């Protein structure tokens, strides 16, 4: 029957409490054994990386995307074990780099090392295995009995089992007993499996705070940053009182994309709603709509691997590519 591949990237799930605190150490095969999984007769194992996900770089996304693409024909499902810190960035970026996969690609990990007795690893691996053999294609994240679309997933808690949520977007599937029950299936168009590794990682994310001036923005441009994301307040906007920020934005927004997302967790941005928003639009700011913060950052990096034309970048950022955005 079904053949699945497990790819190890590291993470708390594979970690041990060494000298300087937890660090990734175990292989993905060892992780499965320790977590007590046996329903894996026809399971292949590959260790791609073995790091605390805080260490993940954009080139690791390239390496992982390539590896996935080389293996989508050979397997019925692929599971990637990964640290939780940057799990959502990786699942978001891979969603852009590897479009219309013919199989489920499921990211998972744990908040508590698999070695530990109270570990969330066995549940998460079980959920991942159940989904990887479901026939439901796409890039997903399995965590705490939930399956979420990889490009709509964010880490919301640092010290809880329920660490990940689907942001502004319905759960794909959820455990009821041992029944993984479907809640919502994304509406894919199924084109040709497409690998597209092009990206530019040189982007800056600045949190809007009272009194912020435009000086660090023009410094970023001088440093050769190719894009800036600003987390505004609430539905989004730029203050015009108190700083040269709006004036600074008006000048820079035609040299580089300036993307507005929100500091809040849920509901995203809508710049048409307030005067501060519409001024931000007039200044050339690109809205990130209802995208997660991780999808916004990775999508911008990915697009910058294709074009530096701000107008075109605006069009692509506003276009729903893989389910990351409400069109």
Ligand X SMILES: CC1=N[C@H](C(=O)O)CCN1
Q: Is 54 a catalytic residue?
A: no
Length of the chain: 327
Residue written as token pair 């203050």: 239
Smallest gap from Cβ 194 to ligand X, in A, equals: 4
194 binds, among ligand X, a copy of itself, none (CB under 5 to 8 A by kind): ligand X
CA pair distance 7, 61, nearest whole angstrom = 13
Within 71-100, the residues that bind a copy of itself by CB under 8 A are 84-86, 89
**Closer by beta carbon to ligand X, 69 or else 131:** 69
263 binds, among a copy of itself, ligand X, none (CB under 5 to 8 A by kind): a copy of itself
**Closer by beta carbon to ligand X, 72 or else 141:** 72
Q: Is 84 a catalytic residue?
A: yes
Residue written as token pair 């594979």: 14
188 binds, among a copy of itself, ligand X, none (CB under 5 to 8 A by kind): none
Residues 6+ apart with CB under 8 A from 2: 42, 76, 77, 133
Longest dimension (CA), the chain: 66
Asked if residue 55 binds ligand X (CB under 6 A), the reply is no
Angle at 58 between CA 195 and CA 284, to 5 degrees: 90
Applying CB under 6 A, among 112, 193, 206, 221 the residue interacting with ligand X is 193
192 binds, among ligand X, a copy of itself, none (CB under 5 to 8 A by kind): ligand X
Q: Residue 167's closest CA among 149, 143, 187, 144?
A: 149
Segment interacting with a copy of itself (CB under 8 A) among 20-28, 67-75, 188-196, 316-324: 20-28
CA pair distance 260, 280, nearest whole angstrom = 9
**Closer by beta carbon to a copy of itself, 265 or else 315:** 265
Q: Which of 233, 270, 274, 307 is catalytic?
A: 274
The 3-state DSSP class for residue 151 equals: helix
Smallest gap from Cβ 304 to a copy of itself, in A, equals: 12
Q: Are 149 and 184 in contact (CB under 8 A)?
A: no
Asked if residue 160 binds ligand X (CB under 6 A), the reply is no
Q: Are 110 and 83 in contact (CB under 8 A)?
A: no
DSSP state of 177: T
Residues facing residue 195 across a β-bridge: 98
Smallest gap from Cβ 43 to a copy of itself, in A, equals: 28
Query: Which region, left, alpha or beta, applies to residue 236 given φ > 0 means left and ψ of -120 to 50 means alpha?
Result: left
183 binds, among a copy of itself, ligand X, none (CB under 5 to 8 A by kind): none
Asked if residue 227 binds a copy of itself (CB under 8 A), the reply is no
**Interacting residue ranges for ligand X, rule: CB under 6 A:** 192-195
Active site residues: 12, 84-85, 155, 274
């Amino acid at each position: 029957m079904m053949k699945i591949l497990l790819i190890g990237m590291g993470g708390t799930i594979a970690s041990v409490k060494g000298e300087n605190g937890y660090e990734a150490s175990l292989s993905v095969k060892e992780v499965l054994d320790i977590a007590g999984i046996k329903d894996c007769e026809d399971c292949d194992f590959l260790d791609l990386k073995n790091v605390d996900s805080t260490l993940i770089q954009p080139e690791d996304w390239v390496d992982l995307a390539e590896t996935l693409y080389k293996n989508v024909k050979k397997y019925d499902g692929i599971i990637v074990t990964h640290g939780t810190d940057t799990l959502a960035y990786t699942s978001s970026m891979i969603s852009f780099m590897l479009r219309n996969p013919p199989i489920p690609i499921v990211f998972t990990g744990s908040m508590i090392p698999a070695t530990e007795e109270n570990s969330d690893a066995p549940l998460n691996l079980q959920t991942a295995i159940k989904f990887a053999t479901s026939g439901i294609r796409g890039v997903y994240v399995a965590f705490n009995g939930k399956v979420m679309l990889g490009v709509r997933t964010s880490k919301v808690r640092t010290m809880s089992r329920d660490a990940f949520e689907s942001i502004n977007y319905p759960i794909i599937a959820e455990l009821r007993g041992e029944d993984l029950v479907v809640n919502f299936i994304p509406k894919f168009n199924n084109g040709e499996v497409t690998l597209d590794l092009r990206h530019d990682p040189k982007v800056l994310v600045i949190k809007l705070i009272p009194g912020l001036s435009g000086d660090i923005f023009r410094a970023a441009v001088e440093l050769g940053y190719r894009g800036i994301v600003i987390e505004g307040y609430g539905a989004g906007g730029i203050p015009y009182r108190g700083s040269d920020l709006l004036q600074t934005i008006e000048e820079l927004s035609k040299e580089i994309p300036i993307v507005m997302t929100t500091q809040a967790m849920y509901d995203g941005v809508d710049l048409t709603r307030y005067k501060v928003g519409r001024l931000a639009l007039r200044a050339g700011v690109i809205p990130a709509g209802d995208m997660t913060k991780e999808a916004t950052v990775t999508k911008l990096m990915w697009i910058l691997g294709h074009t530096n034309n701000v107008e075109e970048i605006k069009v692509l950022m506003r276009k729903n590519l893989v389910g990351e955005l409400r069109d």
